[PDB]
Amino acid sequence: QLTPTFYDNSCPNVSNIVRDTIVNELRSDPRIAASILRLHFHDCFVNGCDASILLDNTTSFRTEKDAFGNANSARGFPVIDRMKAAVESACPRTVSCADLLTIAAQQSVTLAGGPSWRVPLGRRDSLQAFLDLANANLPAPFFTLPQLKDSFRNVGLNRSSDLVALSGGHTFGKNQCRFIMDRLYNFSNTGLPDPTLNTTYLQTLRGLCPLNGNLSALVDFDLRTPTIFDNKYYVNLEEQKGLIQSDQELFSSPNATDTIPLVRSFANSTQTFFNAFVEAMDRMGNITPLTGTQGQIRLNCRVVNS
Q: Looking at the annotation, which residues are catalytic?
A: 42
x/- binding map, residues 18-57, to ligand HEM, per CB under 6 A?
Answer: -------------x--xx-xx--x----------------
Can residue 166 be called a binding residue for ligand HEM (CB under 6 A)? Answer: yes
- Whichever of 2 and 140 has its CB closer to ligand HEM, that residue is 140
Give the phi and the psi of residue 203 in degrees, each rounded to 5: -60, -45
Can residue 70 be called a binding residue for Ca ion (CB under 5 A)? Answer: no
Contacts to Ca ion from residues 178-237, by CB under 5 A:
222, 225, 228, 230, 232
What is the rounded distance in angstroms from the CA atom of residue 10 to the CA atom of residue 8? 6
Can residue 47 be called a binding residue for Ca ion (CB under 5 A)? Answer: yes
Residues 6+ apart with CB under 8 A from 62: 129, 131
Can residue 148 be called a binding residue for ligand HEM (CB under 6 A)? Answer: yes
Can residue 300 be called a binding residue for Ca ion (CB under 5 A)? Answer: no
In angstroms, give the least distance from the CB of 281 to ligand HEM: 7
Segment interacting with ligand HEM (CB under 6 A) among 94-102, 117-125, 138-146, 253-261:
138-146
Residue among 46, 79, 121, 155 that touches Ca ion (CB under 5 A): 46
Residue among 11, 33, 38, 43 that touches Ca ion (CB under 5 A): 43
Can residue 111 be called a binding residue for ligand HEM (CB under 6 A)? Answer: no
Can residue 73 be called a binding residue for ligand HEM (CB under 6 A)? Answer: yes
Segment interacting with ligand HEM (CB under 6 A) among 6-14, 81-89, 113-121, 162-170:
162-170
In angstroms, give the least distance from the CB of 254 to Ca ion: 27
User: Residue 123 CA to chain centroid, in angstroms?
Assistant: 18
Contacts to ligand HEM from residues 235-294, by CB under 6 A:
244, 246
Contacts to ligand HEM from residues 167-196, by CB under 6 A:
167, 169-170, 173-176, 179
Per the annotation, binding residues are 43, 46, 48, 50, 52, 64, 139, 170-171, 222, 225, 230
Per the annotation, binding residues for substrate are 139
